[PDB]
């Protein structure tokens, strides 16, 4: 069964580890690595090997090597993490061109503390040829939706 490597990048504390834990928790209710199947439709299922990271050394090379997709998470309440995420996208686009990139707007549960416009963020992602999605890893809002999307894209 083909496994698609999917990696998590972004600043520390943006919620990478929590995003995936949430993914796994909700799926059971039917570095580190997590096996997860996104049922795209009733006909197609994508087998993801999700990787989650601890630092940035080069081990980075291995981390991203060969990845089919990547989620570059920022924190909606730290635009500092937003601008950092753009860096990560150029890293990938350059050294790992075949990888599908989705920029991920996490902590969406903090509506009122937000510092990064949703609009501004969708715009940058399109400008950079990346997908966008926002998620709340505590509510699990948008989490499954994000992985389903990337999987759609990779089928396509
Ligand atoms: N409010 C809120 N906090 C979150 C969310 N996801 C993660 N956090 C918190 O952000 C911190 C960092 O989470 P972690 O997964 O360790 O981030 P990582 O370092 O990027 O992997 C923790 O205190 C989490 O509870 C979210 O969706 N909403
Ligand atoms: Mg982490």
The Å distance, Cα 98 to ligand 2 centre, comes to: 25
Beta-bridge partner residues of 7: 51, 70
The Å distance, Cα 65 to ligand 1 centre, comes to: 26
If DSSP codes are grouped into helix, strand and coil, which group holds residue 5?
strand
The CA distance from 147 to 96, in Å, is 20
Residue 116: name the closest of 58, 68, 75 by CA: 75
Tell me how the structure was determined. X-ray
Q: Is the Cβ–Cβ distance between 62 and 30 less than 8 Å? A: no
Consult the annotation and say whether 129 binds a ligand: no
Residue 108: name the closest of 18, 30, 11 by CA: 18
Atom 23 of ligand 1, residue of closest alpha carbon: 13
Atom 3 of ligand 1, residue of closest alpha carbon: 107
Q: What does the block give as tokens for 14? A: 């943006």
The answer, yes or no, to whether any atom of ligand 1 lies below 6 A from the CB of 141, is no
The residue ranges of every structural domain in the chain are: 3-155
Which superfamily is assigned to 3-155 in CATH?
P-loop containing nucleotide triphosphate hydrolases (3.40.50.300)
Full DSSP string of 8-66: EES-TTSSHHHHHHHHHHHHHT--EEEEEEEE-SSS-EEEEEEEE-S----HHHHHHTT
Closest ligand 1 atom to Cα of 139: 27
| Helix, strand counts (H, E) of the chain | 5, 6
The answer, yes or no, to whether any atom of ligand 1 lies below 6 A from the CB of 107, is yes
H/E segment holding residue 151: helix 143-155
Beta-bridge partner residues of 141: 136
């Amino acid at each position: 069964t083909r496994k698609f490597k999917l990696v998590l990048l972004g600043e520390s504390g943006v919620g990478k580890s929590s995003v995936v834990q949430r993914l796994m928790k909700d799926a059971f209710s039917e570095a580190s690595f997590f096996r997860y199947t996104s049922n795209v439709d009733d006909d197609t299922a994508v087998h993801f090997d999700i990787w989650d990271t601890a630092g940035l050394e080069s081990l980075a090379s291995m981390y991203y090597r060969g990845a089919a997709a990547a989620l570059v998470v920022f924190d909606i309440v730290s635009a500092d993490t937003f601008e950092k995420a753009r860096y990560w996208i150029r890293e990938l686009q350059a050294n790992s061109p075949e990888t599908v990139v989705m920029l991920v707007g996490n902590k969406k549960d903090l509506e009122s503390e937000r510092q990064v416009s949703l609009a501004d963020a969708q715009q940058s992602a399109g400008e950079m040829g990346a997908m966008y999605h926002e998620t709340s890893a505590r509510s699990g809002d948008g989490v499954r939706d994000a992985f389903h999307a990337v999987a759609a894209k990779l089928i396509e």
